[PDB]
Amino acid sequence: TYLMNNYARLPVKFVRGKGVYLYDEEGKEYLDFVSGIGVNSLGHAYPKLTEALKEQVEKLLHVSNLYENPWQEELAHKLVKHFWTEGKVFFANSGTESVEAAIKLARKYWRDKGKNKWKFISFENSFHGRTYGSLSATGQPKFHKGFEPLVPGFSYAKLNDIDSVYKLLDEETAGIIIEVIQGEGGVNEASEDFLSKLQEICKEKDVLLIIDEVQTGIGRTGEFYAYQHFNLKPDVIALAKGLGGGVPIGAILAREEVAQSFTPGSHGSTFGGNPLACRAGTVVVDEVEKLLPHVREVGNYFKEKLKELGKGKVKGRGLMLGLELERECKDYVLKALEKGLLINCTAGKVLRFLPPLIIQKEHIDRAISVLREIL
Amino acid sequence: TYLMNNYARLPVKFVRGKGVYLYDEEGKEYLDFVSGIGVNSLGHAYPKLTEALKEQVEKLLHVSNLYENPWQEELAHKLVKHFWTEGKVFFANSGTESVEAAIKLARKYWRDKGKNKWKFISFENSFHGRTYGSLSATGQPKFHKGFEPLVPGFSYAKLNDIDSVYKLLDEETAGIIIEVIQGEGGVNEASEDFLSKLQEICKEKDVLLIIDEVQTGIGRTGEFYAYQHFNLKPDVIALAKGLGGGVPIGAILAREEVAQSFTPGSHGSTFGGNPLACRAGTVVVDEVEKLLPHVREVGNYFKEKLKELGKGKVKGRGLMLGLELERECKDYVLKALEKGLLINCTAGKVLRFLPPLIIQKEHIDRAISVLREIL
Numbered sequence A, B: 001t002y003l004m005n006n007y008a009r010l011p012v013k014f015v016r017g018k019g020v021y022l023y024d025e026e027g028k029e030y031l032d033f034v035s036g037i038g039v040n041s042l043g044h045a046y047p048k049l050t051e052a053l054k055e056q057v058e059k060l061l062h063v064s065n066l067y068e069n070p071w072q073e074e075l076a077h078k079l080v081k082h083f084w085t086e087g088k089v090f091f092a093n094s095g096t097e098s099v100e101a102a103i104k105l106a107r108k109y110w111r112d113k114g115k116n117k118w119k120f121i122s123f124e125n126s127f128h129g130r131t132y133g134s135l136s137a138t139g140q141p142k143f144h145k146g147f148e149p150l151v152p153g154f155s156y157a158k159l160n161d162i163d164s165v166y167k168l169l170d171e172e173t174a175g176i177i178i179e180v181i182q183g184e185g186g187v188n189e190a191s192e193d194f195l196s197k198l199q200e201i202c203k204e205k206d207v208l209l210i211i212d213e214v215q216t217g218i219g220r221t222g223e224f225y226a227y228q229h230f231n232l233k234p235d236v237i238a239l240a241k242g243l244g245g246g247v248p249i250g251a252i253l254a255r256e257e258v259a260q261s262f263t264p265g266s267h268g269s270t271f272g273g274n275p276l277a278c279r280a281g282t283v284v285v286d287e288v289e290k291l292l293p294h295v296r297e298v299g300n301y302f303k304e305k306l307k308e309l310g311k312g313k314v315k316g317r318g319l320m321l322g323l324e325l326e327r328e329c330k331d332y333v334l335k336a337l338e339k340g341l342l343i344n345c346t347a348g349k350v351l352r353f354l355p356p357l358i359i360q361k362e363h364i365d366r367a368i369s370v371l372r373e374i375l
């Protein structure tokens, strides 16, 4: 192999996909309940997306941000129209690049006011990216192992433990970074009470609330933005994964007053906001908005069916669900694979389900059927 | 606007490209000598690239590195074939993500060996990216302002000043990061003598040599990798931009021994190595190696014509050229634009030229004529 050994790849290779199914060279069909880790929001070979991309490829792939990028304005408008207040967007290429932008925006925001707030409070079991800024925010030392020193200023509180947050907070704290639901961390849900308090603290202590919606964003949980389940009012949010339906894209959306700190030359990206990614993003956002009622309906159904299995605690909401097992779930992933079902195991014993947002109840029953056979 | 104000965009809206030409919303035609900052290596609507991408879009966009990605193997193989020794590749989505991966690999490398080397020496006027790790390596304080503290351990020496390197090198130095030719910094060329000694220092002081080829890589300077002009032997190189011909992609290539340190779970990327990016890279790499002789010839032709204008010092190699003017080049960019020519101004007074690698002499003459009339 000419590739570095940083991944633990499953012994399977796909060549094509269509709808919620993937196929290997052998022609064997696989029901996809991982969607490339919540990236293939519209499944594979989605007609509207496929046709749009084929057209864009022949027209213009990239010109860079040296020039005006109208397509960025169009997509941004659709993202901001769903935000709780007036806001602006900066486009990136991935979730980690998006979190990086949010951290830089938060720090410069206070510096612009002549205030020395540069610290951040994130949470244990969180995952915000692998690049240095995002890695420092990621509350999992195992991922830090060998790369220290990280960016100074990051401390880790505990999810649903408001007291752990108060303890790490001081007058030098720029922001609090959190995932409404921690995906990679085991589909851990921040409670309404905790989130409500977290918001109050940010208003009270004058600290920015930064929500990482890279995994929960764009309809994944049953609302366009997961923060909307609790009427939260984030200062900045990070987005990626499902936003591009398979095409690499990322973005941060900040409220007007905060966005102002991203002045000319303060930050940028070469590939960021290229016409291909924005074309894909435009298709996805319009489609997810129409699918939301279905995502809520199919999601509730899927959660109910999981509870019926009586094989562990069911976590999450919408189509970001988990099944906490008593044993390590690594082996179940292999057994499901042999049976033509793609599932994921994270946090050691939590099966993570991230099917495409176009998933139907019939496909759900098919997946539940396999689970009942292997658990 | 719905976009943050972090860019200083020229008032031109492109909508389509064909060959080495771009067309804006008014249908006006522009000869592209910037190629989106050296990204559109094969120009726009390149037949072979377009057909390959359209075919890929219909089949598979993304599966994630949870599974085997054969397309990653194929592209890596082609990139390693041109490397000076045996190595491995890690795929990212941008140049900044690539430099970040390199910094991480270098630090973990020494940790695996039981050693305490975590510092890096980079150079003034260098540009390696905007995310925290890369931002720390970037030797331009103006890009740091408001974002500190950065990742600890970075110091900046002076290009072609070997003594400035010694004054910063100690036993805790993990590696030296450099651009063979600093593009963004003003197309600054590292001398053969300097690079020779720098290579010497690394071997004798036992420090890793990391060359950032995001801008110089993939044929831009006449050779597949710019370091080949000096028979250098880097431990790690970073690539991006032109590698994808317009599609976002990035990567680091490291010789076998260093690559070993990227163990399972140590690093990763959700979008990294997706089939769309790899299909693009595969086409570009095959086409570019066939263009190398052409790049060298048209490149030398262009450089000579630039010298003939007698309007400044000509810098660069191959098709990465610059013209250092007596005063700011801000206005000339606009004047050239008005005359249907896209050029770039960097380092305040350096006009940078990065035409597509398929550019021909007839096209060069066209650009030269415009330059003669405006300079």
Ligand SMILES: *Cc1c(COP(=O)(O)O)cnc(C)c1O
Pocket (backbone or CB within 6 Å): A093, A094, A095, A096, A097, A099, A127, A128, A129, A130, A179, A183, A184, A212, A213, A214, A215, A240, A241, B268, B269, B270, B271
């Ligand atoms: C997956 C994920 C990331 C990383 O996204 P990348 O595109 O791999 O950089 C960051 N934050 C959260 C919450 C994620 O789920």
Ligand SMILES: *Cc1c(COP(=O)(O)O)cnc(C)c1O
Pocket (backbone or CB within 6 Å): A268, A269, A270, A271, B093, B094, B095, B096, B097, B099, B127, B128, B129, B130, B179, B183, B184, B212, B213, B214, B215, B216, B240, B241
């Ligand atoms: C352009 C450039 C980068 C940044 O690449 P991005 O994709 O914008 O992160 C890094 N290093 C060098 C040498 C570059 O020219």
